């Protein structure tokens, strides 16, 4: 009989995106007062990642939950507040994300 191998169930990661003239190469979805991206969770989620763009190359994945950006915590953020946090984050965009096994 087979034994289940070790399995990572969820993870928090610090990822550092180097912004290009085209942006970060992500879309975000969700936010306080918006329709939840997932379940009933009103957090900020990565809904799209541009193939081979800055975010992809930094290791961002669709479905990642964005927790903080360059020391700004996103707990309780409305959508536009997260947009503002990312838009204004400069050339290196360091993000803490939560990720679960798919």
């Amino acid at each position: 009989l087979l034994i289940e191998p070790a399995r990572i169930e969820e993870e928090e990661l610090t990822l550092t995106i180097l912004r290009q003239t085209g942006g970060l190469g992500i879309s975000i979805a969700g936010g306080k007062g918006s329709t939840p991206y997932k379940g009933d969770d009103e957090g900020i989620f990565i809904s799209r990642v541009s193939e081979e763009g800055p975010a992809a190359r930094a290791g961002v994945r669709v479905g990642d939950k964005l927790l903080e950006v360059n020391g700004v915590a996103l707990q309780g953020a409305e959508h536009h507040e997260a947009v503002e946090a990312l838009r204004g984050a400069g050339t290196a965009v360091q993000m803490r994300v939560w990720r679960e096994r798919m």
Binding site: I26, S27, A29, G31, S34, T35, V83, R87
Partner: peptide
């Protein structure tokens, strides 16, 4: 609620 998505 509104469904919000933003490309960045």
């Amino acid at each position: 609620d509104p469904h919000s998505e933003t490309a960045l």
